């Protein structure tokens, strides 16, 4: 029921919004599970792991370069902007809204959201392999040798770039190979971020889930922390619920239509 949510929305002093791939998918971003089926012919195993980056950093960078460049034509959808506007409107009332997102596309930041937690990192940050510095990087193309590269057609000539010409660390005494500041399969989440999110999710008195479900990662880590304190949880996703056993609040349909009415 809508007005039952809206009652909580009016009371709530500290909202936490967890976002998944559904929200990014409604902006046309390829997310390798739903839209953009696969890239070239490859799978996560030779693309999104530390092993695969050690074996073939050209191919991984080719892949991540593609995903940076597609963002120039993908824009924030109404869910992204409704959240961001809501944050600002509530923040000025002395009411917090924070975003915990699995998404690496920075669409929340482009929408206007400020208090964001990127638990899988960002396409537009680089971590250096030598010294470990993290830098924002929206340079297109990220490095000369990748210009026009990373084409998605399964029969494209591999760029096969010499490693010393892949993106390197601008701090001159280093010159380390960079990588996307992204959380790959088989790596761990950052401990400092998880603590901060624990703190926020303990503070919160209304938790939203958008583009994913509470059963599945990453919402399942914390939605037990919030629900166990009697905090209401609201899902805005595309999956249905059972014939009889409803959710407490669940709004089926696209986030672009469901969410902006909810947060006005």
């Amino acid at each position: 029921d809508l007005t039952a949510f809206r009652e909580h929305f009016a009371k709530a002093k500290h909202i936490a919004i967890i976002t998944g791939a559904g929200v990014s998918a409604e902006s046309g971003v390829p997310t390798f599970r739903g839209p953009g089926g696969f890239w070239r012919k490859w799978q996560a195993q030779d693309l999104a792991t530390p092993e695969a980056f050690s074996r073939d950093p050209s191919l991984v960078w080719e892949f991540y370069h593609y995903r940076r460049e597609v963002m120039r034509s993908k824009m924030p959808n109404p869910a992204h902007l409704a959240i961001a506007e809501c944050e600002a409107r509530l923040g000025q009332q002395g009411r917090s809204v924070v975003i915990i997102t699995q998404n690496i596309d920075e669409l929340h930041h482009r929408a206007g959201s400020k208090h964001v937690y990127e638990i899988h990192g960002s396409l537009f940050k680089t971590r250096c392999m030598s010294c470990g510095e993290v830098k924002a990087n929206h340079k297109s193309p990220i490095c000369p040798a990748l210009d026009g590269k990373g084409a998605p057609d399964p029969n494209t000539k591999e760029a096969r770039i010499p490693v010393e010409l892949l993106p390197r660390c601008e701090r001159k005494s280093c010159n380390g190979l960079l990588r996307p500041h992204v959380v790959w399969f088989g790596e761990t989440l950052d401990s400092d971020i998880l603590t901060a999110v624990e703190r926020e999710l303990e503070k919160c008195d209304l938790c939203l889930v958008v583009g994913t479900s509470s059963i599945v990662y990453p919402a399942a880590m914390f939605a037990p922390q919030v629900a166990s304190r009697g905090v209401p949880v609201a899902e805005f996703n595309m999956e249905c619920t059972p014939a009889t056993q409803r959710f407490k609040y669940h709004f089926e349909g696209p986030c672009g239509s469901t969410l902006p009415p909810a947060l006005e």
Binding site: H120, V183, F185, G186, E187, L189, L194, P218, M221
Partner: peptide, 8 residues
């Protein structure tokens, strides 16, 4: 520290 997708 937490494995993303909990491993698989």
């Amino acid at each position: 520290x937490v494995l993303x997708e909990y491993g698989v």
